[PDB]
Amino acid sequence: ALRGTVTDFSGFDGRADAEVLRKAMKGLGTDEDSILNLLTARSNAQRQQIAEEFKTLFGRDLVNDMKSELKGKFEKLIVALMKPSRLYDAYELKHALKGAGTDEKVLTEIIASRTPEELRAIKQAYEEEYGSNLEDDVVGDTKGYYQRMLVVLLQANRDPDTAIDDAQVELDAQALFQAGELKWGTDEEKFITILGTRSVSHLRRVFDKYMTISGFQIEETIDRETKGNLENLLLAVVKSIRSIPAYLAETLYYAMKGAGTDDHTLIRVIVSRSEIDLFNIRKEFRKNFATSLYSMIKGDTKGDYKKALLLLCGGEDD
Ligand SMILES: [Ca+2]
Ligand SMILES: [Ca+2]
Ligand SMILES: [Ca+2]
Ligand SMILES: [Ca+2]
Ligand SMILES: [Ca+2]
């Protein structure tokens, strides 16, 4: 089903690669091209072996050297590529959760698009690396029903996907209907329980049945009924239930579409997903926004930063 764009290099020689990186950084100047070309052609697991080979050979920390050598978004991108996959999302959450100014967008984006299996793994690493419990931090920086929805998601206790029970589908569609459009005000608690705990396959049927019953797509009602953080979260969960790739492909588009670029989001989605479903993200991107993810990036991004991105991305036609 899911297809990433980066895979294990076959003739991988951890030690050979390490000296190419040493050569590329020794002396004045930097051969940002050898780095960029080597690192985007190796999987994340290989990038980690390369990192330790470099240390056992030169007694130097690879990431630390590049940090001092590279500059700008190119650096930020290459630094993101070096982060172990099992730690990156935790890392991104901690930096958004550094709530002197919490970045809800990132919280909503990661928590809504990651599966329960991924949420569990993410909560694990986060505590092992930051000696903090993810939930505690979230509850600490967020308030209201937004905070509640995230904690519901954080439990990673979504029902399993079993045979759909039509009566059950009718029950839930009608319930959301009464909890929103037919109610003076909104019963957000009801939306959160259903959207946050029913299985994915079940909710897909509910969204369809809800359409038939009310004449509205759940997304429209959500926009009619809610506002702010909760709305975004609810839209993100709904969109993810329908298709994680499409949701991610959509968040990518809007990161660029406007003027300039939301480099962080562009970096996070591409890196975090390069080895999961970035190929799929690419298809749903073309399908909808009419342009290739490639062409889109290629035209928004500059220099080296643009080249590494295009290499990780790939697919001119997608
Ligand atoms: Ca140098
Ligand atoms: Ca620097
Ligand atoms: Ca209402
Ligand atoms: Ca609204
Ligand atoms: Ca632009």
From Swiss-Prot:
The modification N6-acetyllysine is found at residues 67, 73, 76, 94, 98. The keyword DNA damage does not apply. SMART domains: ANX (SM00335). The modification N-acetylalanine is found at residue 1. The keyword Calcium applies. A motif ([IL]-x-C-x-x-[DE] motif) lies at residues 311-317. This protein is an anticoagulant protein that acts as an indirect inhibitor of the thromboplastin-specific complex, which is involved in the blood coagulation cascade. This is Annexin A5. The gene is Anxa5.
